[PDB]
Amino acid sequence: IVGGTASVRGEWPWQVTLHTTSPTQRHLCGGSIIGNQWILTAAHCFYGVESPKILRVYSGILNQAEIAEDTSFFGVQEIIIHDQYKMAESGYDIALLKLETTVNYADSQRPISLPSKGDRNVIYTDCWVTGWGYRKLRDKIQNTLQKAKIPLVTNEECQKRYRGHKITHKMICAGYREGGKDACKGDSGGPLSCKHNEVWHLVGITSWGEGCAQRERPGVYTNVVEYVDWILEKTQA
């Protein structure tokens, strides 16, 4: 996260940090708890991942420092990548992680409600992007979960900032015309939370962007509401 600040512990209870143990353990991507055994994240986060056996999901984390060898984690039983996904910039950057065990909700870890189809006409004026991603285009995984408030931008406006690219209705953008605040390397898979009527909704999934926080370069996110049917279909046994 560029231009953000340290989060308060438990402030984003749905946020998880997905680690890979290969070659040695490190943070890979962000993700969101949406069900007792389901994490929603970006599909482009499993590039090179041949098995879910090397994945570890940590919930209720604020500082990466809390993660040690003796720290409990959730194993991944299955990685579900949208069948139309090819690459982030082309869209369909969405994936489900079916945990090996169930998450016991608590104030430190609880699910975020998915957007509705009747809420596609709602104007989000309180959206936040979070993660342990980069702070600069040349930094490392941040220790403390960062947060940043960023305004959504219309798709027509976003398309203007991404010539040569196709910004579809299955994507959604957020950013300041002047830049300064945005997601960055490592925030991928993270949630783009928006509070409406005292209720948080998973509006987007951090996906891509030209660089980080550059002026006239809004961050691009998977437009979750366009995948509620897919999510239902893939999560039902």
Binding site for ligand 716 (CB under 6 A): 44-45, 88-89, 133, 182-188, 206, 208-210, 212, 219
* Residue 188: active-site member: yes
Sheet holding 127-131, edge to edge: 5-6, 146-149, 127-131, 191-196, 199-208, 219-223, 171-174, 152-153
**Which pair of tokens denotes residue 222?**
């998977």
State which residue, 139 or 210, has the beta carbon closest to ligand 716: 210
Measured in whole angstroms, the distance separating CA 25 from the mean position of its chain's CA atoms is: 20
Most distant CA pair in the chain: distance in Å?
Answer: 49
* Candidates 7, 27, 59, 93; catalytic one: 93
* Residue 51: active-site member: no
* Candidates 19, 27, 32, 44; catalytic one: 44
Q: Identify the sign of the CA torsion 5, 11, 15, 17.
A: positive
State which residue, 34 or 172, has the beta carbon closest to ligand 716: 172
Closest distance of CB 155 from ligand 716, Å: 16
Query: How would you label 140-156 residue by residue, b for 16+ Cβ within 10 Å and e otherwise?
Result: ebbeebbbbebebbebe
State which residue, 6 or 141, has the beta carbon closest to ligand 716: 141
Closest distance of CB 112 from ligand 716, Å: 19
* Candidates 7, 32, 59, 188; catalytic one: 188
Closest distance of CB 67 from ligand 716, Å: 18
- Compute the distance between CA of residue 89 and CA of residue 226 in angstroms, rounded to an integer: 16
State which residue, 181 or 201, has the beta carbon closest to ligand 716: 181
Residues of each annotated binding site: 160-163
Give the DSSP H/E element, type plus range, for residue 233.
helix 228-235
* Residue 107: active-site member: no
Closest distance of CB 29 from ligand 716, Å: 6
Give every CB contact of residue 56 below 8 A, 6+ residues apart in sequence: 18, 19, 20, 21, 25, 73, 74, 75, 76
Active-site residue list: 44, 93, 188
